[PDB]
């Protein structure tokens, strides 16, 4: 019916789980990460680029003056000189000798080049997770996609399966991301309507196309000196230029946990950490009476060798007795190893040979062959690759990780340690008895 | 040029040039053999794990002579106080049966 099992949340690597009911056959379980998602929810704050300064044609009067306007442009400013007399290809432009003034106007706009070349800025909240299992009982196999959290009853047909919350709540994003041509970078932006000049974020707007652009370049103006027209100015370097040259690495170079971070929408995918609580409610039209399975009547299992090595590196064999033919399922009731089939047809007698991992320098688990547990012991060397491209398919432990001759060297230790001390206890004793009685 | 690279249980990938990532996990191939006489079951495991076996050892020698001379005290004490009482006293004979049965 129900059963409740802990999958590492590595993605490829099988689980394999023996479920059962009395009166039933054995059933093999096998669970895998195929492809896991961490999109956490976003919010678009503004979008920025490279500012292009734009110095509109300057007016002046011939014998006045003109007042600053106020506009809506974004780092608008305006400046009024008191005598210019100015000059163009045709001699002077005006007939008061110094009551000439001149008006000068500075904003900035998007480049035309950005609509490819700019970046967004972006506040993400709690992350969400969703995995893609692949769920295999008996002779069937589904496909069905889940959220990790504990309700959701993502199920493919009748699968009914629930994934339970994560075990560490772990996030690759800080509160405030930067989003640029598809390369993610972790920055502290200036918040909107702040915009410090010489940093990221001195122009800023909610839309490339929004009419309401917002920024402050600390545009100066400054007095003319040459006599032909002119509009000197000077301005802070493009902030949006300078978060360029510094940019750092991405997050696609700088993420933990072997995560992959893709965009649109912004996400990390198949990412390693904690464990995920499944709960899986098999349809009992798989199941299959135990009456009509085949029966083992003895078993016993031989081990050639063994390498506690990351790939399957291990062998074993076992010699069996059934009076049917069929198929049955093999399990290791151990968390040291796993192996690599999970059913195995039967003829009455004869040998079958089955491959395994450990992570443990003993092969002294326990294998079922639709039932009938056997001990298994072994004496496993050390791998001798030092490198491997293959994930280790068995966590390490620790009571199983050290030798047996290393125990009983242990033991052999501490009991002799606490032996002397128990037997001085006790002839102390004995003899203090003794001369209490003396008298 | 040349680059040494530590990479752990875990795993470590590295981009080179215009390449797709590959991928190694590190495996557990000491030298010395985990299975054979104490001095290569030493080796072996300092090699995985130092500071775990530089603990384990130390533990087991403290233990093995702090008990030594808990032992060693325990029979001294024994020692005396059942020789002081009467055949400590004189004009006394103590018999060879209750004298060297803890005698020297």
Known sequence: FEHATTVPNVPGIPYKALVERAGYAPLNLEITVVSSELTPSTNKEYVTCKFHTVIPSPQVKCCGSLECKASSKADYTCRVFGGVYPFMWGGAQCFCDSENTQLSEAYVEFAPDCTIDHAVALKVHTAALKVGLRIVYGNTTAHLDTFVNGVTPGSSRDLKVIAGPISAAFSPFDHKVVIRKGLVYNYDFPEYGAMKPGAFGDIQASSLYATDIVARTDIRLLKPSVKNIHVPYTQAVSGYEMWKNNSGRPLQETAPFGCKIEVEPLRASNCAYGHIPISIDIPDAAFVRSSESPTILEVSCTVADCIYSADFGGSLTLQYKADREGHCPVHSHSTTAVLKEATTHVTATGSITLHFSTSSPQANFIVSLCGKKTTCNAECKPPADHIIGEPHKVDQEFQAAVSKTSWNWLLALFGGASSLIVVGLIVLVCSSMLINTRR | ?104
């Open chain 2, 1 to 104: 040029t040349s680059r040494n690279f530590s990479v752990g249980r875990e795993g470590l990938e590295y981009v080179w040039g215009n390449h797709e990532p590959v991928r190694v996990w590190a495996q557990e191939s000491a030298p010395g053999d985990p299975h054979g006489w104490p001095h290569e079951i030493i080796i072996h495991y300092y090699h995985r794990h130092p500071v775990y076996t530089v603990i384990v050892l130390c533990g087991v020698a403290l233990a093995i002579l702090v008990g030594t001379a808990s032992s060693a005290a325990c029979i001294a004490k024994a020692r005396r106080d059942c020789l002081t009482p009467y055949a400590l006293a004189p004009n006394a004979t103590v018999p060879t049966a209750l004298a060297v049965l803890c005698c020297i």
